[PDB]
Short mmCIF file of C-alpha atoms and ligand atoms in Angstrom, two decimals:
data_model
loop_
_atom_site.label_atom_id
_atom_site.label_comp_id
_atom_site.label_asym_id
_atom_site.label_seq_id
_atom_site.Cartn_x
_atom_site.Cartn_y
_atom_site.Cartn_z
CA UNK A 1 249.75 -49.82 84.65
CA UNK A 2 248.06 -49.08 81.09
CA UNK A 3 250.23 -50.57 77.90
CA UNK A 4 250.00 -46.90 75.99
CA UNK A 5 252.03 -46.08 72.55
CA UNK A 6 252.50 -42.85 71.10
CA UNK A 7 251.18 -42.62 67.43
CA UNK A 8 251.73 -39.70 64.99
CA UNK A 9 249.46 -39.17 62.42
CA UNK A 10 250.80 -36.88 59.49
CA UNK A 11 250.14 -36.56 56.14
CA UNK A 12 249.26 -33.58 54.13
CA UNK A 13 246.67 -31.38 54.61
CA UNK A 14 243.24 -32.28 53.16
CA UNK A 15 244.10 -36.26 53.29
CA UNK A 16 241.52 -37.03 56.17
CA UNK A 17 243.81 -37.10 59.25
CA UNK A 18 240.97 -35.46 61.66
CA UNK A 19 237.96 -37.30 60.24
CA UNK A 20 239.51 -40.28 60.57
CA UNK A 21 240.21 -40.06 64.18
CA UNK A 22 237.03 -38.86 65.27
CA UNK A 23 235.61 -41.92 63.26
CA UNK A 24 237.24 -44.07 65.45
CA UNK A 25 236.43 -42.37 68.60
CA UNK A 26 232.41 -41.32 68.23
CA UNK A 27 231.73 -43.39 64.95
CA UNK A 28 231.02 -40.11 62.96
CA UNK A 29 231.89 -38.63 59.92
CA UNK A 30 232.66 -35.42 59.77
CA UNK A 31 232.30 -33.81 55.92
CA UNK A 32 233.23 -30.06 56.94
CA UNK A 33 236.96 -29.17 55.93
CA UNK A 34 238.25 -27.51 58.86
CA UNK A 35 241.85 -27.21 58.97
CA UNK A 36 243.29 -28.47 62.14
CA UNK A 37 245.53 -25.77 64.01
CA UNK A 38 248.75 -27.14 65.45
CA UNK A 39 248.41 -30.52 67.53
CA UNK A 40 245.77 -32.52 69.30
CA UNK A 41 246.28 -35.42 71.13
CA UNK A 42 243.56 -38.20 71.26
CA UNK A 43 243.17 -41.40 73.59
CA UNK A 44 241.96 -44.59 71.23
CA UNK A 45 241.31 -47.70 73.18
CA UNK A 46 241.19 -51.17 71.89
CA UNK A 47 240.44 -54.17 74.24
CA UNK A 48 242.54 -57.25 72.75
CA UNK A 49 242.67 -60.88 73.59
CA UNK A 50 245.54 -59.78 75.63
CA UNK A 51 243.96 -56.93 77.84
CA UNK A 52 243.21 -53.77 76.38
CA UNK A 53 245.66 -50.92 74.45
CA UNK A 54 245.68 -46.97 74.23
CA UNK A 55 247.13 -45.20 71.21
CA UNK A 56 247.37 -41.97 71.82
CA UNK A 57 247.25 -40.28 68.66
CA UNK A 58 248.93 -37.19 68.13
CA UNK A 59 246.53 -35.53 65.52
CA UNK A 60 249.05 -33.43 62.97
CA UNK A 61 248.15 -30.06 60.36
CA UNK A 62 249.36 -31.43 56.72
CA UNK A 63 249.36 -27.35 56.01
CA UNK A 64 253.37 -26.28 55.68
CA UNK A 65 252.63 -23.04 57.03
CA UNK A 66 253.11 -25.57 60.49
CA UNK A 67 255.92 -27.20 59.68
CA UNK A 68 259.02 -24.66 61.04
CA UNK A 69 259.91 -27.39 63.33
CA UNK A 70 257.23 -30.44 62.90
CA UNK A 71 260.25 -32.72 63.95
CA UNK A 72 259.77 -32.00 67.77
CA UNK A 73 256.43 -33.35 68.07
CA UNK A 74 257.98 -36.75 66.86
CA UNK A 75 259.67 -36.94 69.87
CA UNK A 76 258.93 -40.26 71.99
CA UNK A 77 256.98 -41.83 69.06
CA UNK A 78 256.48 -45.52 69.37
CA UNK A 79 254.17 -46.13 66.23
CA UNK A 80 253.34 -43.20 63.07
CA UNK A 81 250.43 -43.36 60.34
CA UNK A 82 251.06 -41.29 56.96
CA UNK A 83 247.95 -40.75 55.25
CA UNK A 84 247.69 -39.38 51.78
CA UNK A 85 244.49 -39.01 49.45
CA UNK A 86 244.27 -41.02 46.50
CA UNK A 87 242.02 -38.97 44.46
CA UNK A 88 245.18 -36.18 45.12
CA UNK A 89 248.22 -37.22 43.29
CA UNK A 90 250.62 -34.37 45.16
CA UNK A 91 249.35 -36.05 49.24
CA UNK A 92 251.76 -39.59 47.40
CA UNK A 93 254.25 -37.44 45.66
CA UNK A 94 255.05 -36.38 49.26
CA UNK A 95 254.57 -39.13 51.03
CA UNK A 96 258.40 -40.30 50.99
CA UNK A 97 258.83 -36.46 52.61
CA UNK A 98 256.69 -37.88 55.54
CA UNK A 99 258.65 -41.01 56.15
CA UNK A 100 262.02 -39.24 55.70
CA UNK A 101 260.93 -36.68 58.23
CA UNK A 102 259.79 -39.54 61.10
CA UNK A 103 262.61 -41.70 60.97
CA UNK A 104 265.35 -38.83 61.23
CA UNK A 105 263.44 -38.58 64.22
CA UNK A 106 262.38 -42.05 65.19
CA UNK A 107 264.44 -44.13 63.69
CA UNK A 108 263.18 -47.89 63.59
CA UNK A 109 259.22 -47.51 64.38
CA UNK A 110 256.39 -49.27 62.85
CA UNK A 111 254.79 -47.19 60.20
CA UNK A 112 251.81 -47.73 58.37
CA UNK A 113 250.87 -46.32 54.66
CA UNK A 114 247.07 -45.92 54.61
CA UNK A 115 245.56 -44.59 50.97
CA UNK A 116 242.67 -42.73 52.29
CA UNK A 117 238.98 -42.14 50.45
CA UNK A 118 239.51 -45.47 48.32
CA UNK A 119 235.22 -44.66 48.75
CA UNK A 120 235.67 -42.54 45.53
CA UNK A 121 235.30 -44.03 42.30
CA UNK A 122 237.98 -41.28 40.49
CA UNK A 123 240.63 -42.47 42.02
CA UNK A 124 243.97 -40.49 40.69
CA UNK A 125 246.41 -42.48 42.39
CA UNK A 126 246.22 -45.86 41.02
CA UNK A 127 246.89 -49.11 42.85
CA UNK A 128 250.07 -50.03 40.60
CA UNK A 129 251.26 -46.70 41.10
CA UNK A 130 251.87 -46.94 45.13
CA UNK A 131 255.13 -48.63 45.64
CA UNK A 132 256.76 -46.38 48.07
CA UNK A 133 255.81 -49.32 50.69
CA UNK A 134 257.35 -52.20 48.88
CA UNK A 135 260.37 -49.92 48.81
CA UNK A 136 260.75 -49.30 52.61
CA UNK A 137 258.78 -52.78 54.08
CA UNK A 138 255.92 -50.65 55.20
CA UNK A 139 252.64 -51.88 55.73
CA UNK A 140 249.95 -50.23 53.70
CA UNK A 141 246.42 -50.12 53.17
CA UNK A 142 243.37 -48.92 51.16
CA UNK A 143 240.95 -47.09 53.68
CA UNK A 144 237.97 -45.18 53.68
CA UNK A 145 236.78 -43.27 56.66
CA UNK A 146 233.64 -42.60 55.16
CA UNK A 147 232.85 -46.46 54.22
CA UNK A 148 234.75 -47.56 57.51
CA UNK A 149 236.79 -49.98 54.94
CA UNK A 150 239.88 -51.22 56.44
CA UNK A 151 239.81 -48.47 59.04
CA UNK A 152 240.40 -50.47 61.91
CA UNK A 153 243.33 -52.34 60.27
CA UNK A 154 246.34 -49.84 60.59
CA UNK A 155 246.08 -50.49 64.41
CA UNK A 156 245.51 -53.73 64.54
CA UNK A 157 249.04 -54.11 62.43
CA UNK A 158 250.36 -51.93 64.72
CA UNK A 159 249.19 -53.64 67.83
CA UNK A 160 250.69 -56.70 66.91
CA UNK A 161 254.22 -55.17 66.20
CA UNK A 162 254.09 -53.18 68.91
CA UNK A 163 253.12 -55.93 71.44
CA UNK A 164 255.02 -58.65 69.49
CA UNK A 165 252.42 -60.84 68.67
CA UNK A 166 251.10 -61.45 64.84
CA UNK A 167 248.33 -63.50 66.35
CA UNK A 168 246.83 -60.46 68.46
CA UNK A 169 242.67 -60.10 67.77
CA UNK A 170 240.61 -57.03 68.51
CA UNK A 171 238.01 -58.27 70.61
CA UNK A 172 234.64 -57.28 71.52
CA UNK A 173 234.67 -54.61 74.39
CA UNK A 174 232.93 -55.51 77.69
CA UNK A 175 229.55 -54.05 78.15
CA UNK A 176 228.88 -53.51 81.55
CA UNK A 177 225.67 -53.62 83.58
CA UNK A 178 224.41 -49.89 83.42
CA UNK A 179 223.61 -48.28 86.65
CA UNK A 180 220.05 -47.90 88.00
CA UNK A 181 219.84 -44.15 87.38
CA UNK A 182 217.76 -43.57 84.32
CA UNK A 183 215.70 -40.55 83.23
CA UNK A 184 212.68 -39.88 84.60
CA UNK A 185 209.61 -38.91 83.24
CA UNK A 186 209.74 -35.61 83.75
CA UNK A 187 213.45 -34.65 82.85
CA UNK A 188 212.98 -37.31 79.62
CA UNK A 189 209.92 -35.06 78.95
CA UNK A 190 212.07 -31.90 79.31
CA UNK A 191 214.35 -33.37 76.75
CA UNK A 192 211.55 -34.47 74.01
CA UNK A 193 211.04 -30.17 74.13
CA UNK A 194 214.37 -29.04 74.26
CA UNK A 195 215.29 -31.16 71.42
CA UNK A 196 212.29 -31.62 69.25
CA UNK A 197 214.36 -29.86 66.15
CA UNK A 198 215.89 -33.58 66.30
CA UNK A 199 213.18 -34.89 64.83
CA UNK A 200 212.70 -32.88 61.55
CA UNK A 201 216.54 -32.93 61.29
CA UNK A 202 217.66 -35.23 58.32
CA UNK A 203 219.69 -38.11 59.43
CA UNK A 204 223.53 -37.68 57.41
CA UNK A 205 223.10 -41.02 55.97
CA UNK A 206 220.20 -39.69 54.12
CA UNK A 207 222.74 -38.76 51.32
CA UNK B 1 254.10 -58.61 76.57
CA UNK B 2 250.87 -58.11 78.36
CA UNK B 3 249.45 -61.14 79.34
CA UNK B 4 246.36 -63.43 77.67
CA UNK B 5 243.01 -61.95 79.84
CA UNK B 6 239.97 -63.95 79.99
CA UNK B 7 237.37 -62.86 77.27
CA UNK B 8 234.56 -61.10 79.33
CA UNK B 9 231.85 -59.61 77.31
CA UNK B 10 229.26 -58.80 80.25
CA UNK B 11 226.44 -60.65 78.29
CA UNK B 12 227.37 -63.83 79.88
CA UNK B 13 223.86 -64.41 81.85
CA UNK B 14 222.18 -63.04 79.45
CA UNK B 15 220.15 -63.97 76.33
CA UNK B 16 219.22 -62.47 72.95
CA UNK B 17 215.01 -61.87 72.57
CA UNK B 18 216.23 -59.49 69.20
CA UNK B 19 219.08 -58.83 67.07
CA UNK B 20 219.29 -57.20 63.94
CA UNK B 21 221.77 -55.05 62.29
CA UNK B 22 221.50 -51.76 61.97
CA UNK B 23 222.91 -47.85 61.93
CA UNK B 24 222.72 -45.55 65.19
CA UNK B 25 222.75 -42.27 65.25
CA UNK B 26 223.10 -39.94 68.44
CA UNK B 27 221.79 -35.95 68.00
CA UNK B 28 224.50 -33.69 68.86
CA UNK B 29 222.43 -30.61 70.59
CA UNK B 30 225.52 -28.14 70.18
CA UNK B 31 225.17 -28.10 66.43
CA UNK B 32 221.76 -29.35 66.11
CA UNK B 33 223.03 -32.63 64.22
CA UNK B 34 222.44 -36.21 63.73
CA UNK B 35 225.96 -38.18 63.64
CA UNK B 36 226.55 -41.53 62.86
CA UNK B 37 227.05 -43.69 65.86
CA UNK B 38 228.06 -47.10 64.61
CA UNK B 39 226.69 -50.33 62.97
CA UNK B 40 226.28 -53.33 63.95
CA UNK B 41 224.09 -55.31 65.76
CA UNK B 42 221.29 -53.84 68.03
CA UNK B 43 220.35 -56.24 70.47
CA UNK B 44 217.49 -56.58 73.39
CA UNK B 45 218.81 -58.54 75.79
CA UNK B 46 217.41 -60.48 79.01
CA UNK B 47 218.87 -61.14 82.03
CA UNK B 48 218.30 -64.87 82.97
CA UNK B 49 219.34 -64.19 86.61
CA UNK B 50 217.68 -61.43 87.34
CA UNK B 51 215.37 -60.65 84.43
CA UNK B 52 216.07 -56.84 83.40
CA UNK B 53 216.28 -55.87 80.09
CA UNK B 54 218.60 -53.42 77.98
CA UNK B 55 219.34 -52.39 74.70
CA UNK B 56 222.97 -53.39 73.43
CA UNK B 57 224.73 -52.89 70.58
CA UNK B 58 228.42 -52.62 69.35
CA UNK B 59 230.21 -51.26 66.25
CA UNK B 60 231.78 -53.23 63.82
CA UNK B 61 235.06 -53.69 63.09
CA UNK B 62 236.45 -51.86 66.21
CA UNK B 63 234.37 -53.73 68.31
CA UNK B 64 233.22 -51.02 70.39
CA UNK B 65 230.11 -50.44 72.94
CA UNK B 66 227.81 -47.54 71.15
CA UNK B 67 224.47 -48.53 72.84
CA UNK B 68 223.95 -49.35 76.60
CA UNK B 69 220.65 -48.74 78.60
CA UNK B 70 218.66 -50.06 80.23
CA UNK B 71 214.91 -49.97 78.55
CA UNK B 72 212.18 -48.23 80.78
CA UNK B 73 208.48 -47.69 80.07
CA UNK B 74 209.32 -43.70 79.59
CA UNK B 75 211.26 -44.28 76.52
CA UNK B 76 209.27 -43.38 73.44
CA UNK B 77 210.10 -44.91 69.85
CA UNK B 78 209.33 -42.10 67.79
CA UNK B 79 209.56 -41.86 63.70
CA UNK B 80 211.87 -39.22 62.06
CA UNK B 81 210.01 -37.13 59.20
CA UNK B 82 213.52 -37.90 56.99
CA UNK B 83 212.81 -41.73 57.13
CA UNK B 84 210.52 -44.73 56.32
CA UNK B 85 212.53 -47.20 58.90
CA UNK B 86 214.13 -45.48 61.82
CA UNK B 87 213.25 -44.32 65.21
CA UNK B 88 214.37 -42.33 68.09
CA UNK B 89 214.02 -42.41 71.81
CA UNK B 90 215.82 -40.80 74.51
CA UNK B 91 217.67 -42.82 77.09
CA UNK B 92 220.50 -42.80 79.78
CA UNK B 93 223.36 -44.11 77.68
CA UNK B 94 226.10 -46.43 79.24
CA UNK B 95 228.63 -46.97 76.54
CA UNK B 96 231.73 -45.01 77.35
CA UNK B 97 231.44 -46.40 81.11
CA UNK B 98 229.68 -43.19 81.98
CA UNK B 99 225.93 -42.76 82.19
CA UNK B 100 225.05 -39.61 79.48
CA UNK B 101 221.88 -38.37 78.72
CA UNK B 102 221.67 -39.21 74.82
CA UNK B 103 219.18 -38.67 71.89
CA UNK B 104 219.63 -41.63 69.83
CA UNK B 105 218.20 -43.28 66.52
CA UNK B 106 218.29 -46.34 64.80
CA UNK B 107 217.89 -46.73 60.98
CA UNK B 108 217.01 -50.23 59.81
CA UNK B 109 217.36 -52.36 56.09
CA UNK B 110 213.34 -52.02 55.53
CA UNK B 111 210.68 -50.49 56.49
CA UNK B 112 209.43 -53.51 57.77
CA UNK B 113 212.10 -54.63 59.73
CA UNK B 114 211.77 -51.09 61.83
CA UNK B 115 208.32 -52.15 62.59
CA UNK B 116 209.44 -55.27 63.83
CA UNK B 117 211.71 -54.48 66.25
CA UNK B 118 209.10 -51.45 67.55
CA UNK B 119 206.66 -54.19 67.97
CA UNK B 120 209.85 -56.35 69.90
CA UNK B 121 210.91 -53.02 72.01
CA UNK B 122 207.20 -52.23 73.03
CA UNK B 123 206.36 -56.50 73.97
CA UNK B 124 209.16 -55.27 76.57
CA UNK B 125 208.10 -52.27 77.93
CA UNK B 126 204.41 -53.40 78.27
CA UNK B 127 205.69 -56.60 80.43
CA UNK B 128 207.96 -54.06 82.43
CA UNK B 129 204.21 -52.95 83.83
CA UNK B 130 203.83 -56.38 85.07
N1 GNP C 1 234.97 -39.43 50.46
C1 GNP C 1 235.73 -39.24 51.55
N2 GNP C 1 235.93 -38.01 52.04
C2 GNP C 1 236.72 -38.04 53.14
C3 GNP C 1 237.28 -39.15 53.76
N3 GNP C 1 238.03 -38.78 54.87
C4 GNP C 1 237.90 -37.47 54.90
N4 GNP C 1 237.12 -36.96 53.89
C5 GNP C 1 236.84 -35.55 53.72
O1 GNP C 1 238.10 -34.94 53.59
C6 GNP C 1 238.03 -33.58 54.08
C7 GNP C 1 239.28 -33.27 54.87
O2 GNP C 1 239.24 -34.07 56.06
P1 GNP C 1 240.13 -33.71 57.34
O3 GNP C 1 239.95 -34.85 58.30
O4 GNP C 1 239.95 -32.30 57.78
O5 GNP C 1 241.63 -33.80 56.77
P2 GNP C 1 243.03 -33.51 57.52
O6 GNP C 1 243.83 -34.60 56.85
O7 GNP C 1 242.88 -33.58 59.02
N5 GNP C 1 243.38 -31.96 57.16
P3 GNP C 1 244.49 -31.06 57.94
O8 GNP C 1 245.82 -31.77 57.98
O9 GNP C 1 244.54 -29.63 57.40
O10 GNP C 1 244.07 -30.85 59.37
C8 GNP C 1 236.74 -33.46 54.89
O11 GNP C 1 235.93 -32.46 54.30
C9 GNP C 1 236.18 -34.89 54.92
O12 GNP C 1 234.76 -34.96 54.84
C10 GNP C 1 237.06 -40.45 53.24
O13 GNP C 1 237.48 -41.55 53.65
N6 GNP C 1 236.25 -40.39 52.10
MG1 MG C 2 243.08 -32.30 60.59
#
């Protein structure tokens, strides 16, 4: 009996939809562009102080060459995220597009604004300049998937609305006993050939 | 609404011999990368029941497991040629609930600090000849 809540995450294309999502999954960052295609749904799990919750986020394409009849996979939603860039003054301009677009569909769902790669020191859309919130009663933030900053706060909001408690906590996930199969010496020897290339290979936080 | 649950972490018997924070990395074989794991806290932790000892560590901010193994005498702490304070080792990973064969690294705040907690890790493994 899993407490589940479908999320759609739009925005337009560019914004950091994808890379944000798989930072929350694996911890990664991804800095290749690559456009996503259609829809992909992703599981997130967060344990709480009141058991744990699954958002399963409904990965969007920003492009409008995919938007003949976007509407359909708002169907069912119980939460949404609009992400724009704020080094890209045109991902705000259309922002109000987004929202319009959900609640035709949605109606009365919590939404949260999130101001994505607030890392980068040019910022083009400036603080005082994002008011489309204050305007609807949306919750927004300043994140960074690259710096992690704030990037764990749109669902904690959401949590709370969406379980009806402002006094909900993220909580540190259980960490089990592992099993007692481990590698053995010859297999983890195996391994130390097979993947030897890992150890010339720069690590990404090099940079 | 879903009910309070009792807080369970699963570190309950044990305690901390080493915790410092740091970044992990896990090598991704399909595209022959290093990707960011998490940071936080890596910990070696002892079982006061039972004695065994594993490598723990979850990310901040979400919270979530991104190291869980057990440590062995096989695993090797090797340097990387792209850093003065990180190693890698191989291990049987338990984080997602699944056990996964995982190339992992760790990346500390100083040079010295890495040598520290090599010096902590291989303490263990020698007394896991015992
Ligand atoms: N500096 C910085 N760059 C970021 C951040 N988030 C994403 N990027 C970069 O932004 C680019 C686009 O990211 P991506 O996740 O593909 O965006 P998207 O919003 O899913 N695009 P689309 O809707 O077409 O699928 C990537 O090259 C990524 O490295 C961030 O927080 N900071
Ligand atoms: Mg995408």
């Amino acid at each position: 009996p899993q407490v589940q809540f479908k999320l759609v995450l739009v925005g337009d294309g560019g914004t950091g939809k994808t890379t944000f999502v798989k930072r929350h999954l694996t911890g990664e960052f991804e800095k290749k562009y690559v456009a996503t295609l259609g829809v992909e749904v992703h599981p997130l799990v967060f344990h709480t102080n009141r058991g744990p919750i699954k958002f399963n986020v409904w990965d969007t394409a920003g492009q409008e060459k995919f938007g003949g009849l976007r509407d359909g996979y708002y169907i069912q939603a119980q939460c949404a995220i609009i992400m724009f860039d704020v080094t890209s003054r045109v991902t705000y301009k259309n922002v109000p597009n987004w929202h319009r677009d959900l609640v035709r569909v949605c109606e009365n769902i919590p939404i949260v604004l999130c101001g994505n790669k607030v890392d980068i020191k040019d910022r083009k859309v400036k603080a005082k300049s994002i008011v489309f919130h204050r305007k609807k009663n949306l919750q927004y933030y300043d994140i960074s998937a690259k710096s992690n900053y704030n990037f764990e706060k749109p669902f904690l909001w959401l949590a709370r609305k969406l379980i009806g408690d402002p006094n909900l906590e993220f909580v540190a996930m259980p960490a089990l006993a592992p099993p007692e199969v481990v590698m053995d010496p010859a297999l983890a020897a195996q391994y130390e050939h097979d993947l030897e290339v890992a150890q010339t290979t720069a690590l990404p936080d090099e940079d | 609404m879903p009910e309070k649950v009792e807080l369970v972490t699963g570190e309950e018997d044990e305690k901390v011999l080493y915790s410092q924070r740091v970044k992990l990395f896990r090598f991704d074989a399909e595209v022959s990368q290093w990707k960011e794991r998490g940071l936080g806290n890596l910990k070696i932790l002892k079982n006061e029941v039972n004695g065994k000892l594993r490598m723990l560590m979850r990310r901040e901010q979400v919270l979530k497991v991104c190291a869980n193994h057990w440590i062995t005498t096989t695993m090797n702490l090797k340097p990387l040629s792209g850093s003065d304070r990180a190693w890698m080792w191989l291990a049987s990973d338990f984080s997602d609930g699944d056990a996964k064969l995982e190339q992992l690294a760790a990346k500390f705040k100083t040079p010295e600090l890495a040598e520290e907690f090599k010096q902590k890790f291989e303490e263990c493994q020698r007394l896991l000849l015992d």
